[PDB]
Design an enzyme around this catalytic site. Structure first.
Site, mmCIF file in Angstrom:
data_model
loop_
_atom_site.group_PDB
_atom_site.id
_atom_site.type_symbol
_atom_site.label_atom_id
_atom_site.label_comp_id
_atom_site.label_asym_id
_atom_site.label_seq_id
_atom_site.Cartn_x
_atom_site.Cartn_y
_atom_site.Cartn_z
ATOM 1 N N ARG A 22 20.225 -40.385 -69.052
ATOM 2 C CA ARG A 22 19.559 -40.316 -70.098
ATOM 3 C C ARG A 22 20.818 -39.273 -71.370
ATOM 4 O O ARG A 22 20.971 -38.942 -71.480
ATOM 5 C CB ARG A 22 17.763 -39.867 -70.020
ATOM 6 C CG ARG A 22 17.565 -40.281 -68.346
ATOM 7 C CD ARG A 22 15.834 -40.186 -68.970
ATOM 8 N NE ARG A 22 15.625 -40.382 -68.198
ATOM 9 C CZ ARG A 22 15.098 -39.015 -67.434
ATOM 10 N NH1 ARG A 22 15.838 -38.153 -67.278
ATOM 11 N NH2 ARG A 22 13.576 -39.465 -65.394
ATOM 12 N N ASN A 68 3.552 -36.437 -54.044
ATOM 13 C CA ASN A 68 4.652 -36.848 -54.685
ATOM 14 C C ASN A 68 4.978 -38.508 -54.530
ATOM 15 O O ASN A 68 5.791 -38.354 -53.981
ATOM 16 C CB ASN A 68 5.336 -36.376 -55.320
ATOM 17 C CG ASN A 68 6.374 -35.991 -56.733
ATOM 18 O OD1 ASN A 68 7.882 -36.444 -57.130
ATOM 19 N ND2 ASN A 68 5.606 -37.109 -58.069
ATOM 20 N N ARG A 77 1.003 -34.771 -57.762
ATOM 21 C CA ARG A 77 2.094 -35.447 -58.918
ATOM 22 C C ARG A 77 1.442 -36.350 -59.401
ATOM 23 O O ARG A 77 1.626 -37.340 -59.206
ATOM 24 C CB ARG A 77 3.421 -34.552 -58.601
ATOM 25 C CG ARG A 77 4.014 -34.897 -59.991
ATOM 26 C CD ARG A 77 5.661 -34.550 -59.541
ATOM 27 N NE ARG A 77 6.292 -34.511 -60.831
ATOM 28 C CZ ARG A 77 7.372 -34.058 -61.116
ATOM 29 N NH1 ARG A 77 7.984 -33.725 -60.102
ATOM 30 N NH2 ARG A 77 7.820 -33.264 -62.454
ATOM 31 N N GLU A 122 7.508 -26.860 -57.514
ATOM 32 C CA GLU A 122 7.251 -27.897 -58.409
ATOM 33 C C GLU A 122 5.516 -27.963 -57.353
ATOM 34 O O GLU A 122 4.025 -27.771 -57.752
ATOM 35 C CB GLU A 122 7.355 -28.855 -58.939
ATOM 36 C CG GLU A 122 8.372 -29.025 -60.256
ATOM 37 C CD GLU A 122 9.022 -30.017 -60.287
ATOM 38 O OE1 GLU A 122 10.100 -30.369 -60.609
ATOM 39 O OE2 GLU A 122 8.182 -30.926 -61.298
ATOM 40 N N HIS A 146 7.875 -31.432 -67.546
ATOM 41 C CA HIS A 146 8.563 -30.700 -66.272
ATOM 42 C C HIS A 146 7.581 -29.839 -66.745
ATOM 43 O O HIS A 146 7.445 -28.857 -66.146
ATOM 44 C CB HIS A 146 9.704 -30.919 -67.054
ATOM 45 C CG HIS A 146 10.846 -31.354 -66.225
ATOM 46 N ND1 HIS A 146 12.114 -31.776 -66.949
ATOM 47 C CD2 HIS A 146 11.186 -32.185 -65.555
ATOM 48 C CE1 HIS A 146 13.604 -32.306 -66.441
ATOM 49 N NE2 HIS A 146 12.472 -32.968 -65.669
#
Lengths: 400, 400
Positions: B240, B7, B90, B386, B179
């Protein structure tokens, strides 16, 4: 008692003269194109529609023409001007100050101006209407009824945006919500129809028209609403974009060389239903008509429109930890059995079932229940009457 | 079979070396501060944590150091580099092209670059990782797994914004969601735990961490997700803003003399949890800790955070016309019994009841059911993995 109900927007004043006792509209109309050329008054007295051509440079001279013709014994409805017992005004934004309707004095009037920068396109013209009414009808009480007031019960968890808190401290940027006095009217009216007290009902109200918002009305108090700091948030509207990804505007501005004004305008004037249909129409029934005629693209605009409504019902159901009833109202909510049906198809997991027969019947101004006897959540069509709501608040306050 | 899972973000590569057969992490780590001064590799082999200081000017020289130390027979885990049977990457954004994970060839590589402008801050560094891996491990197959791919099943009614359609035609502005491979992982894992086929379950998955999104997973396919064209939309996140009134940014820019860049940044770096807490923290458990200590203000941030999650569950329940199960995952979903409890309090109208005992127990990486036996909607904590998900897609593709 006789209440004159006024709604003054930047370009026009529209009025109803209601007789509280019979709750009868004696007459209604609109003074149009104030400030612009070929301004006029359209005046309705039952079946008759009278058009008066005249220069109306501002709201005062416009309200004068209205008052004159209320009395003119050809197109008139009352002998004197003394017949008008009170005047009720729609004021768009009340801010955090005004929790409920108020009798207007100098204090209130100054306090409304102070809130005006929170709806610069609307409040100014409301005040214009109030000040004109107090001038031409000295001694007659005026009551202000606030579009934002019903929503002042919304808890903090629900009105603060996930933005620096400084922005609330400094500019009072929060969710205010709109269509307040409509959500208030229909939620109350629905409870009456169900033969139950409002304080033991969880009602979700769907004011769906050229503009649209949903309200979560928990035990008589509003706990959340779709519109935000402004009328841009939430449902798909005629020309407004509703909810979107905060980032999109910034991307579009930058990729196209567009000032924030130019972008805000696009979101406000050219988006929503109009935007989705590539400029076909902003009137939802123009699309309904075309979708029923087999136009594939409109069927989609329709589905998009309906979908977001359904999601809001779902969302607000969660907010209240239950739904007891759902109310459709305004231009589309009252007149689109198809939209009502599509929206409800998403809701049978909650125990919502419509009666197809009743749904198609309750059209063009009729009111009633549309859920089946066995339906676990009740669904109602309650045509909104924001004016009568104003007249009723005026009546209560004035009796004193 | 041995998959190396990568990743690569702009500043770092983080890796796991998994043994498919045992589905065992042989080692993992991170190459940090690539490009910046004092770059380094943190390498974990079971209990031991080894720090290697070295200049790493780019991702290639960084991946080299990773590969070297996978083999170094003091800090190593495999005899050869030939031991690595495949490499899984990823890639944040797949766009509309990539519906599922793919074996990387020149075609795929070019096709990823073409999508890169839709996530300019992420895709470039992903490719850097792929190109470096193909260079240093010639012949070893690479598989790309896309954060947006799981969400490609979302219907039109759900991914088109109520903005001029031209904007989709011209720039492909739609909801993509993120996601993806986490929502995919936990939804699948939950179905296994319930002893039921995924295609007969309506699951709402809540990936709630430093970024947060919800997915509506109807019969194995995603039908809606909280994040949008970008990761700004939806839930309150660490820094955010999540969902807000489209108009607010324009107001703030104009009242303060701020470029769209300066505003976008504020919404992205200084908002959400951080913004709400006046700059206290962006880590939700920093707030949880302070709220439990009696700090009134944090209790509110917490409530705001939870509330919006609850609304999304409600909204998505409506979207699927039912919920069969709700899954909490990621940093907070896995570790905040309080958040899980608060969120679920809004949901008993759906038949959701938590087992307080089980809720408080399933903390810090444990997994299980938290709904009571009698609960009509099942609630599960499924710690996300993940990387394993990537290794598994890599495994399947490579076997061929």
């Amino acid at each position: 008692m006789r209440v004159l109900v006024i709604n003054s927007g930047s370009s026009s004043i529209k009025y109803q003269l209601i007789e509280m006792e019979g709750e009868k509209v004696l007459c209604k109309g609109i003074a149009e194109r104030i400030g612009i050329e070929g301004s006029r008054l359209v005046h309705r007295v039952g079946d008759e529609k009278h058009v008066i051509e005249r220069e109306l440079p501002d709201h005062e001279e416009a309200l004068k023409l209205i008052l004159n013709t209320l009395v003119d014994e050809k197109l008139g409805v009352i002998k004197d001007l003394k017949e008008i017992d009170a005047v009720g005004h729609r004021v768009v934004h009340g801010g955090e100050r005004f929790k409920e309707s108020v009798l207007v004095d100098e204090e209130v009037l100054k306090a409304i101006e102070e809130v005006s920068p929170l709806a610069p396109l609307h409040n100014p013209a409301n005040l214009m209407g109030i000040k004109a009414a107090m001038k031409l009808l000295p001694g007659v009480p005026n009551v202000a009824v606030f579009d934002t007031a019903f929503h002042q019960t919304i808890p903090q968890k629900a009105y603060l945006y996930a933005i620096p808190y400084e922005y609330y401290e400094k500019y009072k940027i929060r969710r205010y919500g709109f269509h307040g006095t409509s959500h208030r009217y229909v939620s109350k009216r629905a409870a009456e129809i169900l033969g139950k007290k409002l304080e033991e009902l969880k009602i979700i109200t769907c004011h769906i028209g050229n503009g649209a918002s949903v309200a979560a009305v928990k035990y008589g108090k509003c706990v959340d609403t779709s519109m935000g700091f402004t009328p841009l948030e939430g449902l798909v509207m005629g020309t407004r974009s509703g909810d979107l990804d905060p980032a999109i505007p910034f991307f579009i501005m930058e990729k196209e060389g567009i000032s924030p004004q130019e972008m805000y305008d696009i979101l406000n004037k050219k988006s929503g239903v109009y935007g989705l249909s590539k400029g076909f129409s902003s009137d939802m029934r123009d699309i309904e008509e075309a979708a029923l005629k087999g136009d594939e693209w409109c069927k989609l605009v329709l589905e998009i429109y309906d979908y977001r409504i359904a999601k809001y019902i779902g969302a607000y159901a969660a907010a209240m930890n239950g739904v007891d009833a759902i109310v459709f109202t305004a231009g589309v909510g009252e007149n689109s059995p198809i939209t009502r049906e599509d929206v409800c198809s998403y809701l049978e997991f909650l125990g919502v079932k419509l009666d197809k027969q009743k749904n198609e019947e309750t059209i063009r101004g009729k009111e009633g229940i549309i859920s089946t006897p066995d339906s676990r959540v009740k669904v109602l069509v309650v045509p909104t009457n924001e004016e009568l709501m104003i007249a009723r608040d005026t009546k209560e306050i004035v009796e004193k």
